[PDB]
Write a protein that binds this DNA or RNA. Sequence first.
DNA 1: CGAGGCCATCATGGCCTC
DNA 2: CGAGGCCATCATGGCCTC
Lengths: 117, 117
Amino acid sequence: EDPKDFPSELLSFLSHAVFSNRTLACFAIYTTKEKAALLYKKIMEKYSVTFISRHNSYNHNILFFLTPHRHRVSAINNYAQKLSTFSFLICKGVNKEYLMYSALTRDPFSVIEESLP
Amino acid sequence: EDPKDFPSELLSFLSHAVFSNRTLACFAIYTTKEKAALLYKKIMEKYSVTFISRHNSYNHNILFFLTPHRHRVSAINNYAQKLSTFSFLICKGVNKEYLMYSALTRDPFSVIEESLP
DNA sequence: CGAGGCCATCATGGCCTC
DNA sequence: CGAGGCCATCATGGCCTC
């Protein structure tokens, strides 16, 4: 039922590092449409986001975003966990920023909302 | 009997990469005193070496050297294998150049020969 | 082909601080 | 302590060529 990773199509644009203290500035979260609508507003505010888009991903929503400062993926996961409870919530750092966004606007993906195009 | 790696004291200065196409310019070979005396002259010539020292390492000899151009560790191993046969021959790339040399001049290590100090 | 170069990418982990 | 930043190091592997 609930996804356990991102969609194969996306997996190459993503960091899967487990033992890294690396900070980055582009992230994506996979969760339910309604949790993603909430996190859109909350994440935008928390991280003074430079950009943030919400996307349809299969039965669900992918939040994509970039931040003025860097964060550990863990830190953003710990932040989102404080806002609500989630059936699933998968939070991953984005290695290939432009290519993640492009594909999430493309298909089987749609834009729902975004602070620019 | 014959060593199967370099001495623990040295292991941190060394590359242990198995699946890398990386080229570098500083190497060390662990082998018998007599194979090392041979490779000293031969390695110097083959690689137009910028520097090369031979060292006493326990019952044995460590060849240390730097090259004007870069090489895969594998390439230098393949070269040394063409010169003779060896009871053991351990060829490794050197990550920390200065610190490898310093320690090999230090102790339980001595210089035997070197194209400078 | 496969030996032996090139490079960009990014995970590892040491370190530091509130 | 331990969350969450910083960075330098260097292994991975894609690519290319004789």
